[PDB]
Amino acid sequence: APNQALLRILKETEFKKIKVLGSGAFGTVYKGLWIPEGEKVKIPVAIKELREATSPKANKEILDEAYVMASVDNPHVCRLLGICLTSTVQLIMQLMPFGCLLDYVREHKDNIGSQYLLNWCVQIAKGMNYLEDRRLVHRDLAARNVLVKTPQHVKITDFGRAKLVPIKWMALESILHRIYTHQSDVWSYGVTVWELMTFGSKPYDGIPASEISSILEKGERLPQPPICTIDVYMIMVKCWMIDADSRPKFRELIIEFSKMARDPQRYLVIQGDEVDADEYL
Amino acid sequence: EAPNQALLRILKETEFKKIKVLGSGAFGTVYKGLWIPEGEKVKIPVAIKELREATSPKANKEILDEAYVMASVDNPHVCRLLGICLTSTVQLIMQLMPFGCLLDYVREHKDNIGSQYLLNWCVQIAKGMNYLEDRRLVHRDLAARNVLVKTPQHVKITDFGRAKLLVPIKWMALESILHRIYTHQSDVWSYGVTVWELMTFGSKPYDGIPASEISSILEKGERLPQPPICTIDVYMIMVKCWMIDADSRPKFRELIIEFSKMARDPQRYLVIQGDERMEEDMDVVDADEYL
Ligand SMILES: *CCC(=O)Nc1ccc2ncnc(Nc3cccc(Br)c3)c2c1
Ligand SMILES: *CCC(=O)Nc1ccc2ncnc(Nc3cccc(Br)c3)c2c1
């Protein structure tokens, strides 16, 4: 029907960049402070200035992404706050205090519980299902791209493609033919999960990126994280089937983990197991 | 309701090669090959199964459930799955058993097999099948060419293609032939023929009989005949397993016990009268040395 989600346009002077968050091949990120004009309030944010090259073809393109971060309302996907109109469009968004899901697990890894890990998997599967339900391919899904609002709430948030290269996290169809379907995302999901279960291991460490396409024919994949039971590692493997049709659908993944979420210690073995923008409104 | 921490190693194909073909089921085939972990100067003897050639997805979601199972059981009497491979058409790795199919071993060293050796295998198998019936599972396919020999002192079941929970007709119960109904008691019928197989050192059950008159033969009340080296005490247990009434058949728990009695005194139940027992480099450690 009508799709009335506001796009709010902010002027740059209202907010400044503090420290750099990460770098992508085209464009970068900052964590900064938004200070509405004369409102005595400093809102924590995240800003993305475009890849500096700015030619026009890319601008009609960067904007379609802003359209999207702006048009989805779901508990599991970040929601875009503002955008800026520099010559090279910038995008604004609420900052998530606990950082990338990838960082959070490295810093409080001695403390993460089995109950906590499954809840994140079930949540992400929902966030990805919402988009697959909305017919949309993320194409870039992986640990450094899910966020932590509170250890109890996570949200997907990079859309660099959001088409409606990260090879280690891409399906075989992708590497060889640049074919992304909803099921090509599932392959990424499978590696994203392996990421949590190692609290931050680099998938395929030290394997030159070019030998990767050949490794997968040869039939090798990522190994079994320690704290994983075989019931969990099996779902990771199924997502890596060379046949895109053999992979689980994001709808079914929500369900499978919801089962394990009921009984976390039966599937995960851990030693010693046991101002806000959002506020703004 | 205890967690399942069974490992599943994923291997890349280049790490191992197929040497000679082993056996065949029309969809799928075995192989005996050599697994060579990357640059670890070791050649491990293996067995590989490249599943049946088509990869209709429907079948892939199915082939993997089998791998889940060979992987999830720890018992001295069931082979245990080592690795799997991710070709498009899934493949499976497993520790090779040096003495081959239990069906082959008995043909090549038949003039030397002793009464004590034969009963020990029966009691062992009964345990291997009980372990599965105890974990709610039907092989559906059990027969001589599917038990293996680790050492003349240790045997293990190993083929699951069917692996169902809840066609080799000569080895199937009557419920199976007419209605495809496998229960744990319908494996018992197979067991009965598997044993008859040992007691003939490899005779083809129902030889020359066209497979289609087999369902009719069984209602006529005929069955497999008495292997010579069998006393009637042993052949009776074979017949009881062939009762048309699935409820009349012996349970795998009870079979373990019955043979354990005969295993105490092998010459009182088996008559052999030869009775008494007993260039290719080695780079090569069998399944155990490598974790
Ligand atoms: C791990 C470093 C990091 O990305 N941390 C972080 C914290 C909170 C966030 N809140 C909102 N956005 C992002 N990242 C980000 C990436 C791309 C585009 C946008 Br506007 C925001 C984070 C990231
Ligand atoms: C009698 C020929 C034969 O099957 N020999 C043989 C020796 C050792 C084995 N070790 C492991 N597996 C098998 N067979 C087999 C069949 C199906 C699937 C798998 Br991965 C292995 C044998 C067989």
Q: What is the DSSP string of chain B?
A: --------EEE-GGGEEEEE---B-SS-B--EEEE--TTSS--EEEEEEEPPS---HHHHHHHHHHHHHHHT---TTB--EEEEE-SSS-EEEEE--TT-BHHHHHHHTTTT--HHHHHHHHHHHHHHHHHHHHTT-B-S--SGGGEEEEETTEEEE---SS-B-----TTS-HHHHHH----THHHHHHHHHHHHHHTTTSPPTTTT--GGGHHHHHHTT------TTB-HHHHHHHHHTT-SSGGGSPPHHHHHHHHHHHTTSGGGTB--SS------------TTT--
Distance CA A7, CA A2 (A): 14
Do residues B144 and B194 lie in contact, with contact meaning Cβ atoms separated by under 8 Å? Answer: yes
User: What would the two tokens of residue B169 be?
Assistant: 């007709």
- CATH no. of A96-274: 1.10.510.10
Q: What is the CA(B47)–ligand 2 centre distance, in A?
A: 6
Tokens of B106: 């008995």
What secondary structure, in 3-state letters, does A164-206 show?
A: CCCCCCCCHHHHHHCCCCHHHHHHHHHHHHHHHCCCCCCCCCC
Is the alpha carbon torsion for B133, B137, B140, B141 positive or negative? negative
CA B147, CA B125: separation in Å to the nearest integer?
8
Residues of B in contact with A217 (CB under 8 A): 87
Q: Which is nearest to B77 in space by CA: B167, B155, B181?
A: B155
A177: Cβ contacts below 8 Å, ≥ 6 apart: none
Nearest chain A residue (CA) to B73 = A230
Interface test with B, best of A217, A230, A239, A240 (most B CBs within 10 A): A230
Dist. CA B79 → ligand 2 center (Å): 9
Phi, psi of A241 (to 5 degrees): -65, 135
Question: Where in chain B is CATH 3.30.200.20?
Answer: 1-96
Nearest Cα residue to atom 6 of ligand 1: A99
Q: Strand B81-85's sheet: what is its strand order?
A: B9-11, B81-85, B91-95, B44-50, B32-35, B16-20
- Residue range(s) in chain B whose domain bears CATH number 1.10.510.10: 97-284
Superfamily of domain B97-284: Transferase(Phosphotransferase) domain 1 (1.10.510.10)
**Resolution of the PDB structure in angstroms:** 4.0
Measured distance CA(B127)–CA(A204) in Å, rounded: 42
How is residue B204 written in tokens?
A: 């083809």
Residues of chain A with CATH 1.10.510.10: 96-274
Rounded-to-10 torsion of CA A196, A200, A206, A212: 30
Residues of A with CB under 8 A from a CB of B: 215-224, 229-231, 233-234, 237-238, 240-243, 245-246, 263, 265-269
Over the Cα atoms of chain B, what is R_g? Answer: 20
For residues A148 and A120, give the distance between their C-alpha atoms in angstroms, rounded to a whole number.
Answer: 10
Query: C-alpha dihedral over B109, B115, B116, B122, to 10 degrees?
Result: 80
Radius of gyration of chain A (CA): 19
Q: How many CB atoms lie within 10 A of CB B155?
A: 24
Active site includes A140? yes
Asked if residue A33 lies in contact with residue A44, where contact means CB atoms within 8 angstroms, the answer is yes
Q: Which position has the token pair 């007691």? A: B199
User: What is the token pair recorded at B146?
Assistant: 């599917």
| Chain A positions in Cβ-Cβ contact with residue B55 (cut-off 8 Å) | 243
Report the C-alpha gap between A194 and A233 in whole angstroms.
8
Q: Strand B32-35 to strand B44-50: parallel, antiparallel, or no bridges (unpaired)?
A: antiparallel
- CB–CB of B8 and A224 under 8 A? yes
Shortest Cα distance, chain B CAs vs residue A229, angstroms: 4
Q: Which long-range contacts (CB under 8 A, 24 or more apart) does A135-138 make?
A: A135/A164, A135/A182, A136/A68, A136/A162, A136/A164, A137/A161, A137/A162, A137/A163, A137/A164, A137/A180, A137/A181, A137/A182, A137/A184, A137/A185, A138/A162, A138/A185, A138/A188
Q: Which protein residues are within 6 Å of ligand 2, measured from CB?
A: B 22-23, 30, 47, 49, 79, 92, 94, 96-97, 100-101, 104, 148, 158-159
**Cβ < 6 Å from ligand 1: which residues?**
A 21-22, 29, 46, 48, 78, 91, 93, 95-96, 99-100, 103, 147, 157-158
Architecture of domain A1-95: 2-Layer Sandwich (3.30)
Architecture category of domain B1-96 in CATH: 2-Layer Sandwich (3.30)
A189/B123 Cα distance (integer angstroms): 48
Assess contact for B238 and B198: CB atoms under 8 A.
no
Q: Are B262 and B238 in contact (CB under 8 A)?
A: no
Q: Read off φ and ψ for residue A51, nearest 5 degrees.
A: -60, 140
Q: What is the DSSP letter of A142?
A: S
Please tell me the experimental approach by which this structure was elucidated: X-ray
Write phi, then psi, for A251 (nearest 5 degrees).
-70, -40
Task: Tell me how many degrees the CA angle B136-B142-B146 measures, rounded to the nearest 5.
Answer: 120
Contact B55 A243 (CB under 8 A): yes
Distance between Cα B216 and ligand 2 center (Å): 33
Cα angle at B284 between B283 and B285, to 5 degrees?
150
**CA distance linking residue A271 with residue A227, whole number of Å:** 9
Residue in B with minimal Cα distance to A264 = B3
- Determine the number of helices (DSSP H) and then strands (DSSP E) in chain A: 8, 8
Residue B169, number of CB atoms within 10 A of its CB: 12
Structure tokens at B12: 């890349």
Rounded CA-CA distance B144/A205 in Å is: 45
Closest Cα in chain B to A240? B86
Contact A145, A98 (CB under 8 A): no
Helix boundaries (H) for chain A: 56-70, 101-107, 114-133, 172-177, 182-196, 212-217, 230-238, 250-262
A110, A133, A140, A273: the catalytic one is A140
A128-141 as b/e, with b when 16 or more CB fall inside 10 Å?
bbbbbeeebbbbbb
- Closest residue by CA, ligand 2 atom 7: B100
Give the distance, in angstroms, between the CA of residue B278 and the centroid of all CA atoms in the same chain: 25
The interaxial angle of helices A230-238 and A250-262, nearest 10 deg, is 170
